[PDB]
Design a protein around this ligand. Structure first.
Ligand code: NAP
Ligand code: 5P3
Ligand code: ZN
Length: 318
């Protein structure tokens, strides 16, 4: 099942997440990505940050060479990291992802986070006291370089991630904009359902792509270990039993029925094969409303290490 983007291109509504916590060997990304394609995932997500571009690329190209899928059947996303916001650094960053993937183009390229950091190899550059070295870049300038990647054919569609309403409006209202973002990829699940943001994106022809839809990796110290665990939620568990399925499949189906494109990461073969079954059942309107009731302002990935700078996206209401 696919959604038509404001760019004419299509995006599978179920996506395979590929981030894993630093402690997971990079070899794991390889087999898990192969498993996902085999189970039926067609839309995979990755970015320079994840240090996995090479493995995911190996996996996808294996699946294309064995004949399982054609390149046009795969929807592959990449993301421009905070250290390459500067306009003249955007194309090299994308081209570097491409060389690592061994692919000639990505289906989707996102500005990964609206706060910039010092250019260089280090993804989170720090001074000699451990203090983060932030950068000052006009996101409108970043966006115009992202646009030229689309003009060059290196990215089929382009979009954003972790932008708030203010920041979406700054891109939309930029003098001479060529292409609106096709999507805003943000944290979304039953505990933090982003109704306001989802409505706003919808009003502007932007898809909301929900990350950490299963309650997140819970990796420390990015996510407070004292936060409630989404998948232990009693109502998701009751809904799972009633439909002969699990709580993860309930959270995934919820997003598909409210107009959201949803990601799901797993490196476990059983969970991978299970997650594609979201298309096999549905929730009634009263069940959707029960899930809506779960919303409790629990943002798992606060990324508050990046608070301070003017573009920190999460101090605003949405
Ligand atoms: N743009 C951004 O800034 C941003 C931020 C966060 C995430 N993302 C993207 O979104 C993807 C997913 O988010 P996330 O990585 O936080 O993970 P998630 O999709 O919310 O899943 C979290 C955990 O749920 C487990 N899980 C998966 N299927 C399950 C099932 N059927 N039953 C029980 N547990 C299940 C996985 O562990 P197992 O592997 O052990 O199955 C995984 O660790 C990421 O990998 C990344 O691609 C983007
Ligand atoms: O999956 C992602 O895209 C992701 C991004 C950041 C990150 C770190 C710093 C600033 C913004 C995003 C941190 C974690 Cl733990 C993630 O899983
Ligand atoms: Zn039902």
């Amino acid at each position: 099942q696919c959604v038509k983007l404001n760019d004419g291109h299509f995006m599978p509504v179920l996506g395979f997440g590929t981030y894993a916590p630093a402690e997971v060997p990079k070899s794991k990304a390889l087999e898990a990505t192969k498993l996902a394609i085999e189970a039926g995932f067609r839309h995979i997500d990755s970015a320079h940050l994840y240090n996995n571009e090479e493995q995911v690329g190996l996996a996808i190209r294996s699946k294309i060479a064995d004949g399982s899928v054609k390149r046009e059947d795969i929807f592959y996303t990449s993301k421009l990291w905070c250290n390459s916001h500067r306009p003249e650094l955007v194309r090299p960053a994308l081209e570097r992802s491409l060389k690592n993937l061994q692919l000639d183009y990505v289906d989707l390229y996102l500005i990964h986070f609206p706060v910039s950091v010092k250019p260089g190899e280090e993804v989170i550059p720090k001074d000699e006291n451990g203090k983060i070295l932030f950068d000052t870049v006009d996101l409108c300038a970043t966006w115009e370089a992202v646009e030229k990647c689309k003009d060059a054919g290196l990215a089929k569609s382009i979009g954003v991630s972790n932008f708030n309403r203010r920041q979406l409006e700054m891109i939309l209202n930029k003098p001479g904009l060529k292409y609106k973002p096709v999507c805003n990829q943000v944290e979304c699940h039953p505990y933090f359902n982003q109704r306001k943001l989802l409505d706003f994106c919808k009003s502007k022809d932007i898809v909301l792509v929900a990350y950490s839809a299963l309650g997140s990796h819970r990796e420390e110290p990015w996510v407070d270990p004292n936060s409630p665990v989404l998948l232990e939620d009693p109502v998701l568990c009751a809904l799972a039993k009633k439909h002969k399925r699990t709580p993860a499949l309930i959270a995934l189906r919820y997003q598909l029925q409210r107009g959201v494109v949803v990601l799901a990461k797993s490196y476990n073969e059983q969970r991978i094969r299970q997650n594609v079954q979201v298309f096999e059942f549905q929730l009634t309107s009263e069940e959707m409303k029960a899930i809506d009731g779960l919303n409790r302002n629990v943002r798992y990935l606060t990324l508050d290490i990046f608070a301070g700078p003017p573009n920190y996206p999460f101090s605003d209401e949405y």
